[PDB]
């Protein structure tokens, strides 16, 4: 846990980041994207909540 506290301080890409690095560290990303396209429901909840819903209507 000491190491972990230090690790959040010494590892944190707080600015911009490539989505490829996120896919690489979490294939959970690619799994969900593939499942959402496969489901044919491309709704992302939390992107309308803790991100703007960016609606016009």
């Amino acid at each position: 846990l000491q190491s972990t506290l230090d690790n959040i301080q010494s590892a944190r890409p707080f600015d911009e980041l490539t989505v490829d690095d996120l896919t690489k560290i979490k294939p959970e990303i690619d799994a969900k994207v593939e499942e959402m396209v496969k489901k044919g429901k491309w709704d992302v909840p939390g992107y309308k909540d803790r991100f703007g819903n960016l609606n016009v209507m």
Partner: protein, 37 residues
């Protein structure tokens, strides 16, 4: 980012595509009928 995620368009978009093929043939004949003049 740019990655192929399969879509089964041959059973999702099958009636649209069938309509497209029929009209493709029909517009060939329509074009031929109009090219008389």
């Amino acid at each position: 980012m740019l990655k192929r995620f399969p879509t089964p368009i041959l059973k999702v978009y099958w009636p649209f595509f069938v309509a497209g093929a029929a009209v493709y043939y029909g517009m060939s004949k329509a074009a031929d009928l109009s090219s008389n003049t």
